Amino acid sequence: PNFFIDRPIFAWVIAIIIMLAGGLAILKLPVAQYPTIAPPAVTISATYPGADAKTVQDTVTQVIEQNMNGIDNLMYMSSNSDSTGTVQITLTFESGTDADIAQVQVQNKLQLAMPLLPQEVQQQGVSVEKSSSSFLMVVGVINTDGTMTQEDISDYVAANMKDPISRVGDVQLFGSQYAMRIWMNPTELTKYQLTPVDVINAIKAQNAQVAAGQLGGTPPVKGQQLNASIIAQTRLTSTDEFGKILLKVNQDGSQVRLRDVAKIELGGENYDVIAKFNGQPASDLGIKANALDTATAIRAELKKMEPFFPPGMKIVYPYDTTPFVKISIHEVVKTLVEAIILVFLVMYLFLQNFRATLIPTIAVPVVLLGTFAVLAAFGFSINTLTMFGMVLAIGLLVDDAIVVVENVERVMTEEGLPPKEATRKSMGQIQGALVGIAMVLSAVFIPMAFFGGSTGAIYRQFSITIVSAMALSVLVALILTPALCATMLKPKGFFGWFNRLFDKSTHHYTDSVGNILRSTGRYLLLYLIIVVGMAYLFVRLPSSFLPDEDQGVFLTMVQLPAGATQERTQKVLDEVTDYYLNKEKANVESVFAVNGFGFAGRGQNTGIAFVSLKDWADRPGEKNKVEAITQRATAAFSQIKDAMVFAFNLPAIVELGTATGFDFELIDQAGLGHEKLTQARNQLFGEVAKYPDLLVGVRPNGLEDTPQFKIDIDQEKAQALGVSISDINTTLGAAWGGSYVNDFIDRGRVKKVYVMSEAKYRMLPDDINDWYVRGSDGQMVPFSAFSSSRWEYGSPRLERYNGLPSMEILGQAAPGKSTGEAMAMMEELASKLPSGIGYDWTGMSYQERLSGNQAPALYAISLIVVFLCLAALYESWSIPFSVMLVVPLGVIGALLAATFRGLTNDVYFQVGLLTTIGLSAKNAILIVEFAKDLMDKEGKGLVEATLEAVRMRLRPILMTSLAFMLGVMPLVISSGAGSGAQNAVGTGVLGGMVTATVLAIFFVPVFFVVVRRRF
């Protein structure tokens, strides 16, 4: 309005205020390369020392799966069961809910079922926690001295850091804590006729701590004048003085002390997990609100102890992402900077007035700040993509300002109107046009919130960003612009030539237009031909979900055959470290190799290797680039190999994996039995490999049967010999498996006690015979007495899906094939199989199929609402249609690019499409808005009004367009870190806009012409 044509500063102040607010935003908000994107998933952990997967499923898990019931938004419930007595159970809860609450919903249940359970486990640990696979980061620690061991490290740590640290979704500690370990000598127990049972018991007794009452505490006596507390034993505090743990005394008189018949050692709480950083032994932490603050408070909690470390105690940040992120963000900001400073001069071109250009110079930043303050009002996680949203906001931000600029400029110079009335005339013209364009453009991005999914939220954030940005841009366009002009604007040979040439060219081209408008059929047909090629492209699409880029690290798994060791594992893992360090040294900065932690649960035949790399400024070799490195290492690890080795990159999202892929999950409905499930499953592998035209990479994520060694016990003779079957089982377990006897103390820290057989006696079938047992009467006896032994094959893995023994199938559809038709193939093959066999999909292969294929609804709805705003501006049923025909034009321009260059589809792509769409609209909008009134209220010739409108306005349509174009260019120009997404974005919008803008100038007129002459 002109409320501000009373008052220059009132709006100056509004604006300074709003920018100040956006500035307030800078600090109080989050920072991340990505927002919260996954649904909230919960996990349960359970432990049973020394047994089978089948064992627990039949003892522990199956219970839980039975007695869970009544839990909100319970999407689904998967469960693993491994043969190290470990269970991880994952329940995903429907999107947009509260972990903090369902965690409890679930823990109450986990506690319904506990007493059903053992005392071993019930006492060991039964934990509830939350899902996070992608480790926020990692830390490693090595002994530079190279003199001590990993358990030393881990013990130090736990005594020092982990608890301070945990006060953060998860902390994981590879290794274990100092726990005392009683390595049992069986031979000498036989000598002295002892089953370990006596050992366990004597230990339970000689290591404890008990009440002592007090002296005269509660009711005293008359004249009593003293009170104190008594104290009994404590927990024995040394291996040495467990050596003193007395059992027995010989009849001769000699006693029986423990130390003489076993190794009393410090060792692992367990260790089926080992680490070596650059090959040198070390230990670690996997660490997981906020990203940067997290990192920095962590570095702080670290520094304190940094000087307090023992000698040869060095840290490492082997697996990290933060600096990557910051660098990406910083340069993506340099982007904005350069894009704006371009405009700074693009004005000077057609204005040449050091203050003809400053209103735009000024406004934009204020608007970006308004967007900051938007997300401030609503939080919404300042982060990368929501920042790209700022990038694309630019030209929208730009247009209306450029517009008013040239409007007033022409009104004054073309005619000689003082600033006030010149401007207010421009306004009497253009007031509502801008409202129109804004309401239009919003019709594109608004409809996306009602679109659901993790992508649902991606679109929510990016689009609401875009749209609020436009809102504020408009508002200011309608506030301060009107006065700035009459605030600094009074009523070359390096550019004079250019103005000359511009004037010549505009006349040449408008003349070509006057010539061609007479011809319509040919160019009319060309429009449709363009549409057809557009559809040809829309069908020739490659397709994806998101890209992945160098992040300073990557990974490689290692799988050995059934039957394995830490040793045959670690030898190979060492060959790997050797390769990476020796042949590709220049980029291989370090390595964090591991032994034990598999990717399909945990085990022995599994290993994982993290790879850390050099700086972005010293890794320019495209040949020795990230993915080519992996490529060539693969061949290196597919040649002289006797074990499977995937070697590859890190998908840069929290466990979403291949989106063109799928993960089928087969289930035994009705008591068919594990064996039949396996049979039909391998059978289906063999049967489905028949169609390598739709279905590719069909491997099971589960693992195969394995030699299980059974020891059958003949109850009869056991009873016959005065024996406790319990004594049998207990000797067995305490020797071979382990046992949580009790606790002891060290440095105010309690710690565990295990009593397990010495190593070299507990490793082989024949070793069994070395074991004896004390019958009732008292005489040591072998297992050979009553023990049968044999072999078979059973699985070490057992998975279940919501109640039921289930198996997994990792697969992918052909690239030019949706995952849906692959689901059709899978159902066709499997549903044809015997009764009792059901199935389901999951994860991606579930999520993306429950809601997919709605984006067309977005675009139809936007189309509609835009038609509406059009007729609103026009009160014309007929006119709107014309301008909508502008949609397709920019489209091809982007589409063709994806083939003109090696680029593909994603979110970014849909987004740039919608963007260029709204932009072409904006362009034609004000063109026609002019021409119409220029006809009606000037009574001009319809065609003549078109020509007048285009002539009076040709320079800015060029200006703003090309300006946004040049602002976007650098990305496509830009390479290096992050350049993946950067270029992916910069490409499509240029491609589309070039076409849209270079072409509308000839057909907007024709569209309107034919609309009017056929109506």
Author numbering: 2 to 168, 172 to 292, 297 to 499, 510 to 1033
Give verbatim lines from the article:
The action of the resistance-nodulation-division (RND) transporter AcrB provides the principal antimicrobial resistance efflux function in Salmonella enterica serovar Typhimurium (from here on, S. Typhimurium). In vivo AcrB forms a complex with the outer membrane factor (OMF) TolC and the periplasmic adaptor protein (PAP) AcrA, forming a functional tripartite complex with a 3:6:3 stoichiometry respectively, that spans both the inner and outer membrane.
STmAcrBG288D structure was determined by single particle cryo-EM to a global resolution of 4.6 Å. Furthermore, to minimise structural artefacts we decided to pursue the determination of STmAcrB in a native-like membrane environment, by utilizing styrene maleic acid (SMA) copolymer for membrane extraction and direct solubilisation of the protein from bacterial membranes. As expected, based on the high sequence similarity, the overall architecture when processed in C3 symmetry is similar to that of E. coli AcrB and the functional biological unit of the protein is formed by three protomers displaying overall 3-fold symmetry. However, analysis of the novel cryo-EM structure reveals that the G288D mutation brings D288 in close contact with the well-resolved sidechain of F610. However, the residues around D288 show a notable shift, which may accommodate the increased bulk and the major change in the electrostatics of the pocket associated with the increased hydration detected in our previous work. In particular, F610 is positioned further away from position 288 causing an increase in pocket size.
